[PDB]
């Protein structure tokens, strides 16, 4: 019941792309990088947890053993398949693999065609762009370069396709081998403290495959121990294929390149098999392996000549050296020299397994194999031969004491009497230390340093055999310098100073080290002797202390061993000075020991180091002294004496240059280890301080070890850096390393010295660090200096970044100057690195990585915050930015060529399964370069840079970054990020066409590679990254790329085809990725709607249902329930969904298909009604509490100082406003940030950031719902669903009005809400009044508006004018709705008494902007005086309206838009009878006849259409306002004011003439009605008295004839100019005519 | 339908066209206020016509 | 130190 479903998914998925098969390349990468997300991914988890994959990895031979699976192949290929089947059949016929494996490899190659095409030589345009960028760096091949057309036409050929298929087959073989090897490594030597998911997966895989259960006291190793022969037998087929290529393969394909590729693949497979065997063997170290397998293995090696026949070529040295080393390692492992000698000397049976010692045939085979190997003249057999010789040397003696099975061997090959052959072999092996040199080389290739060929654990477990051999060969050959240097190169491996970390690993990895202190043979022979030979033999003891301090940082059981050895050294040994010949006497105790006793009181360095008289010593023939002392203090004193350039003839000899360098290096490493272990829990924080105090002990009080290093630098820096020998450069590197080490525990003195180091732009004296530039050769001697100086500078900048604090003796100016000098030196190094010639590329790669990381940390630290905390490095960051954004045109390319060269070297580095150190270093270098490019792009985008000369080079760098990911998947996210930032800089700056730089074929390949968002694993980080990249690429003016990415060449394989598949599962998908997916959807809709909306409507049955599901089951208050950070994510998702719904509804309305969709969607707005316009979830309480608690504990640093500078797009997470990524390292130095039980300020800051993100999501949802409801109000115009609609609108208005009163958010963090949410309710009430569907429930709705108007500070004429105007319009529409509807009058008189009067008085006082405000107030009063509740409370309101004496100021302002508005205001005031008569009093007539407007009125120019603006304005102010007021004041009393109106009429007859003349064969018909009523009333009055109304000044003939001749032709002169947004007037006009017939007739 | 939609389409962000609804509302409100104040003047005159009798 | 690769010396080892 073990099928290949998960192993080989159906062909339909592989072709359609719905499920990318987890090829062995991805598994190998995930197992090599030890990535948590990928290893814990569902796809890979199910793939590894399957029993089929377990059986396959436990039997790799079956994966390629020739079988007849024709039936399975036909069943899989049945139910572009013809070509796939043809290629599979051809491959199965050529190679002996089965048809299923061939089909799988062909499918994988088909899915990986993008990479195979991108790893091809570039086109001609690319070479031209590279040459233009270049203005060394000659890694191109233009002689063979061709265009893209001929490159693609040749790619689709048959021969090239078959060659690519074979290359992919070999690559997949190598990937499978590496993946199974890494899986066995991780399962056997799993590191502790790993994630729970990793441990669970490991336990599951073990229990399923090998039944290896950790809870069992004795797990089942059987199934794990049976993995050695499984690969030892496959090595046979590997070497057979290496020595002979497939015969059935066509001869045309068997070219030199193919032969080399096949040989390299076979060598890699053999190396991986050997490594897996070595791992399965060391899994059971003490017990022996089955001799039946070692017999066959030794016969195999004898026949194949230890793979020297296939490795004999000179083109496989890089793979041969590690292959030979691993062969030697596995040979020494299966030999078990230690256990073999234990058995030969103990004679006790191990009982684990029978050894080959009981079989004489195996011994004979091993002996003849070793003899043949030594006679063939091969170096790989040196350690194995030597070991075997030792074994025979112990068997001979074993036979002499017994003079049993081994005797048969000893007598079969005539090895009993004579011992000549093995002795000669050992002599030859030890001559010239060839065996030791080859062992050191193997350890280097099998170590942990970056130079090692395998992973750190692989080398850690491989060095065990060599260490045991040296243990077993120590007591035989005497102590000598060669074995010591060999063991040193083994244990240390030649790693650097920064290769030391406190990362806790499995005890197994530390075994190889602890063995030095566990076994007595390696303790009393190497460690004790190394300690005794000091400082005479300084390098061994120094390197031993260094490696011990680097390896035992986390081991608390042996953490004080280095400190003990350094502070309590048991003995002393140094050269003898002839001057001391008269200061000793021989005790004549033992002449062989040559002991003696001091007779004089020797004073060394004449507290100071004094030795007491009477100390014993041994002459080692130099001499040993058995005196207890602290070697650290003596070493510091020697360093001081050497730095002072003083020599003592009567004292000990001075340290050598190399000796001093190694001393300072070991001191720096020990200090770093102490500083790293002190921070860890359980240590002592005084460890580094105590170490420095001991180092500066018994020294002059005026100086310490730091001062000693300062004097050393000052003495060695006198001459030019170029005029320095190797060892002096090693000394300078070591002193810089010691400064780096001491930077942690004593930053103050380090900065004080760097301020005057005189080595970085310090003074004009020779010795500056910038003079080592030019076209020089930076070998290992000259590279160890800069590689350390750059890291020292990076550490200095990191320490300075913590400006929130140990620091006695520093100041802001000093740190700023040091940082500026460091930046200048780093920039000089970055500009000069493009000319040096390094012995290898790894050195230059590390240098570029270090300088780029330093520059990136400098740039980010400057813009991450905007407070004073980032001022120490501000001149430096500023300098670097001015020099990398706007450099001079002469040196512009010198700063860009390094990046181009790095990208070239990365895009043409071959893929290799070995040397993981170089791979990870190159990956980190690429990621640092990409991050630095992104930082530069963001810096250019900020500060307002309109012309970025770096963009021209970044385009041609993206030309290479498009193919760079093809070499490594790790680069897929960083590269995309960079591209996103380049696009962002191209937006706020058409831009340079990116298709011209990328190319059609290359661009299509990149799109086909990136369109699938991390399909094989499905991680969230790389998903959000690719969705932000897609959104940024679409938002910009990119159109070709956007079209190719959306259409896919609708969409069938385009990004959207997968975005819909992710949208249809948002109910279970991570909310974090859902936000990015929705952002991509919105970015594709707003810029490319015609495609996205079309595809969504064609597939709406899957999206609308999921949207409704999300909306219905989205609670409003999610904080109280389970989940606190998910609230902001859910709010953002809802906001994006609402925005998309609104956009699609707008599109449908434009298409007139939005009725049914809107009617179905309105029933899903529940979540909106719950958590929409209401922004009261700001919880200012906890924010204020946190601010107070932070200001009380940090008086200097404020909470607002951590505000982001808007350098990077703010994340909607725990770092929206407060920079947590920096705070974690800035405030975590003192107690209070960490907190007990995950408490303190960190959790509160995280909660505050989450609340701010939630508020931002609420604002986004506010805007989205605002647009949605604004369009729906127009959509839902008909008379249906009115109830729910009005309820929702009223609820929204109430929530807005309540939030306007409740606690407001800050204005510096978020945008001011004033005037942002008022127009929303304004337009809502507008449209609801237009529909006339209000429930006249203003009794409570107006209270909030009144409270807001009262508590707004009365900014009538302040800067907050929009807010005042929108509030006035809101209250206007509210009181109008109220008018349509008593308990209302008492609630609406407040606005008539306190609001209108106060605002009118303020406006009248300010006017001494204003016109529109006064008109709005007039309209407010007019619409407010119309409420039915006022027609009875007129009595009550007369006093409030008369108390402010508004009429006086109105008439004053009337004394010309201001006069118009004042006239309208007093008119609306006269609407009440008491006010009507009050205005009708003589107060009015006075100014009415004295007004200055009468100047223009008397002029005949008056007219409605008069050319002059003044004349028409006056005519309108008279027609629209004066006549209604006249009628109103006449209503009060007419008989008394008739003389007055008569005099006014005869004083200005021009108005009457113009009114009766313009109309010949409306606001004027109202005038006619007013005149008719006036005539009627004045006639009725005159009927009694004749004194008044002397003349009517009005005609009946003309006016009657007019109204006769004006009762379709009427539309001749009806051109309404004012109203143009809406039968309208004719009805009114006829009504007025009826009124005329009612007054005149 | 899609043919005409693509023919009469403009290359510009969609979120900017819907925004024009705000401008349109700000331009309609004026006429709406003018209609309010005209139906109000009308009402007032009516009530006066019912006061005189 | 002494004779290289001492092949004759006998010790308890």
Swiss-Prot record, chain A:
It holds the Pfam family Nup188_N-subdom_III. Gene3D superfamilies: 1.25.10.70. It is a peripheral membrane protein. One of its GO terms (molecular function) is structural constituent of nuclear pore. InterPro entries: Nucleoporin_Nup188_N, Nup188, Nup188_C, Nup188_N-subdom_III. Its main location: nucleus. GO terms for cellular component: nuclear membrane; nuclear pore inner ring. Keywords: Membrane, mRNA transport, Nuclear pore complex, Nucleus, Protein transport, Translocation, Transport. It is found in: Nucleus, Nuclear pore complex; Nucleus membrane. GO terms for biological process: mRNA transport; protein import into nucleus; RNA export from nucleus. Component of the nuclear pore complex (NPC). NPC constitutes the exclusive means of nucleocytoplasmic transport. NPCs allow the passive diffusion of ions and small molecules and the active, nuclear transport receptor-mediated bidirectional transport of macromolecules such as proteins, RNAs, ribonucleoparticles (RNPs), and ribosomal subunits across the nuclear envelope. Due to its 8-fold rotational symmetry, all subunits are present with 8 copies or multiples thereof. Part of a tetrameric NUP188-NUP170-NIC96-NUP53 module. PANTHER family: NUCLEOPORIN NUP188, NUCLEOPORIN NUP188 HOMOLOG. Functions as a component of the nuclear pore complex (NPC). NPC components, collectively referred to as nucleoporins (NUPs), can play the role of both NPC structural components and of docking or interaction partners for transiently associated nuclear transport factors. NUP188 probably plays an important role in NPC assembly and organization. Belongs to the Nup188 family. This is Nucleoporin NUP188. It comes from Chaetomium thermophilum (strain DSM 1495 / CBS 144.50 / IMI 039719).
Swiss-Prot record, chain B:
It is found in: Nucleus, Nuclear pore complex; Nucleus membrane. Belongs to the nucleoporin interacting component (NIC) family. Functions as a component of the nuclear pore complex (NPC). NPC components, collectively referred to as nucleoporins (NUPs), can play the role of both NPC structural components and of docking or interaction partners for transiently associated nuclear transport factors. NIC96, which is localized to the core of the NPC and the distal ring of the nuclear basket, is required for de novo assembly of NPCs. Component of the nuclear pore complex (NPC). NPC constitutes the exclusive means of nucleocytoplasmic transport. NPCs allow the passive diffusion of ions and small molecules and the active, nuclear transport receptor-mediated bidirectional transport of macromolecules such as proteins, RNAs, ribonucleoparticles (RNPs), and ribosomal subunits across the nuclear envelope. Due to its 8-fold rotational symmetry, all subunits are present with 8 copies or multiples thereof. Part of a tetrameric NUP192-NUP170-NIC96-NUP53 or NUP188-NUP170-NIC96-NUP53 module. This is Nucleoporin NIC96. The lineage of its organism: Eukaryota, Fungi, Dikarya, Ascomycota, Pezizomycotina. The gene is NIC96.
Curated annotation (Swiss-Prot), chain C:
It is a peripheral membrane protein. Disulfide bonds: none annotated. It is found in: Nucleus, Nuclear pore complex; Nucleus membrane. This is Nucleoporin NUP145N. It comes from Chaetomium thermophilum (strain DSM 1495 / CBS 144.50 / IMI 039719). The lineage of its organism: Eukaryota, Fungi, Dikarya, Ascomycota, Pezizomycotina. The chain holds residues 706 to 718 of 1793 of the full protein.
